[PDB]
From Swiss-Prot, chain A:
Location(s) in or outside the cell: Cytoplasm; Golgi apparatus membrane; Nucleus; Chromosome, Telomere
Protein name, as recorded: Poly [ADP-ribose] polymerase tankyrase-2
Tissue expression pattern: Highly expressed in placenta, skeletal muscle, liver, brain, kidney, heart, thymus, spinal cord, lung, peripheral blood leukocytes, pancreas, lymph nodes, spleen, prostate, testis, ovary, small intestine, colon, mammary gland, breast and breast carcinoma, and in common-type meningioma. Highly expressed in fetal liver, heart and brain.
Coiled-coil regions, chain positions: none
High-level lineage: Eukaryota, Metazoa, Chordata, Craniata, Vertebrata
Role of this protein: Poly-ADP-ribosyltransferase involved in various processes such as Wnt signaling pathway, telomere length and vesicle trafficking. Acts as an activator of the Wnt signaling pathway by mediating poly-ADP-ribosylation of AXIN1 and AXIN2, 2 key components of the beta-catenin destruction complex: poly-ADP-ribosylated target proteins are recognized by RNF146, which mediates their ubiquitination and subsequent degradation. Also mediates poly-ADP-ribosylation of BLZF1 and CASC3, followed by recruitment of RNF146 and subsequent ubiquitination.
PTM: Ubiquitinated at 'Lys-48' and 'Lys-63' by RNF146 when auto-poly-ADP-ribosylated; this leads to degradation. Deubiquitinated by USP25; leading to stabilization.
Membership in a protein family: Belongs to the ARTD/PARP family.
Species annotation: Homo sapiens
Subunit structure: Oligomerizes and associates with TNKS. Interacts with the cytoplasmic domain of LNPEP/Otase in SLC2A4/GLUT4-vesicles. Binds to the N-terminus of Grb14 and TRF1 with its ankyrin repeat region. Interacts with HIF1AN. Interacts with RNF146; this interaction leads to ubiquitination and proteasomal degradation. Interacts with NUMA1.
Superkingdom, natural source: Eukaryota
Whole-protein coverage range: 1115 to 1161 of 1166
Swiss-Prot record, chain B:
Protein's recorded name: Poly [ADP-ribose] polymerase tankyrase-2
Quaternary state and interactors: Oligomerizes and associates with TNKS. Interacts with the cytoplasmic domain of LNPEP/Otase in SLC2A4/GLUT4-vesicles. Binds to the N-terminus of Grb14 and TRF1 with its ankyrin repeat region. Interacts with HIF1AN. Interacts with RNF146; this interaction leads to ubiquitination and proteasomal degradation. Interacts with NUMA1.
Tissue specificity as recorded in UniProt: Highly expressed in placenta, skeletal muscle, liver, brain, kidney, heart, thymus, spinal cord, lung, peripheral blood leukocytes, pancreas, lymph nodes, spleen, prostate, testis, ovary, small intestine, colon, mammary gland, breast and breast carcinoma, and in common-type meningioma. Highly expressed in fetal liver, heart and brain.
Residue ranges of domain PARP catalytic in the record: 8-161
Post-translational modification: Ubiquitinated at 'Lys-48' and 'Lys-63' by RNF146 when auto-poly-ADP-ribosylated; this leads to degradation. Deubiquitinated by USP25; leading to stabilization. ADP-ribosylated (-auto). Poly-ADP-ribosylated protein is recognized by RNF146, followed by ubiquitination.
Species the sequence originates in: Homo sapiens (Human)
Function: Poly-ADP-ribosyltransferase involved in various processes such as Wnt signaling pathway, telomere length and vesicle trafficking. Acts as an activator of the Wnt signaling pathway by mediating poly-ADP-ribosylation of AXIN1 and AXIN2, 2 key components of the beta-catenin destruction complex: poly-ADP-ribosylated target proteins are recognized by RNF146, which mediates their ubiquitination and subsequent degradation. Also mediates poly-ADP-ribosylation of BLZF1 and CASC3, followed by recruitment of RNF146 and subsequent ubiquitination.
Subcellular location, record wording: Cytoplasm; Golgi apparatus membrane; Nucleus; Chromosome, Telomere
TM spans (from-to): none
Domain of life: Eukaryota
Coverage span on the entire protein: 952 to 1112 of 1166
Protein family membership: Belongs to the ARTD/PARP family.
Annotated positions binding Zn(2+): 130, 133, 138, 141
Length: 47, 161
């Protein structure tokens, strides 16, 4: 596992092409996330 | 130390988590290759993950980040998809859940789009698809995502294609 950029606690990947894409994020310490909900699902075949 | 509590579909908490799941689906540039072809999900169960030790671990670090960033944790709720969610919920996130080859370096990755994290549920690039049918687009097999509380603190802004 790498380190944060100096002076930062995470990285934000801001989408710059796909106008519809939301952000993605990276943390470098496991203690910076808590797995609050387990969601069980299936993807649905479109009509 | 982990216990899982089932949320009722009548519970407002179940409903707000489902809505975030469904409303952050998007089309992907791979036409469904990694994660499958779908516009929405069938939610089978939503469970609250309870572990005292992992939670205190989280809040301890959160306070540290906060005091380094004018009392602002910059906390988000974000999705995480992987083949190892059942280890994560018992032992917490650590360096074994790091995407060594990701765009932004060897760290632990989260998405605002649920459909993005869905691409990683069977492995990087969807791996070989579901274990039972080897179908990245399986409509039968049960999949699991985590909806996670994440401390970002001061976040480095990377513009990216
Ligand atoms: O949910 C994610 C899981 C993972 C992921 C990647 C590699 C792993 O070995 C892993 O366990 C999870 O990667 C993502 C990358 C993104 O750009 C956005 C979300 C994820
Ligand atoms: Zn299957």
């Amino acid at each position: 596992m790498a380190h944060s950029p100096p002076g930062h606690h995470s990285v934000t990947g801001r989408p710059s092409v796909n106008g519809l894409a939301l952000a993605e994020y990276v943390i470098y310490r496991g203690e910076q996330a808590y797995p609050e909900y387990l969601i069980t699902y299936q993807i649905m075949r479109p009509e | 130390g982990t216990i899982l509590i089932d949320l009722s579909p009548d519970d407002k908490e179940f409903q707000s988590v489902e809505e975030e799941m469904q409303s952050t689906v998007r089309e992907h540039r791979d036409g469904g290759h990694a994660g499958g072809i779908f516009n929405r999900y069938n939610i089978l169960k939503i469970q609250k993950v309870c572990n005292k030790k992992l939670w205190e671990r989280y809040t301890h670090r959160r306070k540290e980040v906060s005091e380094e960033n004018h009392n602002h944790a910059n906390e988000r709720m974000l999705f995480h998809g992987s083949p190892f969610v059942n280890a994560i919920i018992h032992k917490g996130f650590d360096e074994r859940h790091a995407y060594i080859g990701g765009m932004f370096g060897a760290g632990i990755y989260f998405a605002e789009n649920s459909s993005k994290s869905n691409q990683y549920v069977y492995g990087i690039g969807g791996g070989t698809g579901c274990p039972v049918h080897k179908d990245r687009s399986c409509y039968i097999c049960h999949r699991q995502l985590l909806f996670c509380r994440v401390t970002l603190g001061k976040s480095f802004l990377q513009f990216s294609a």
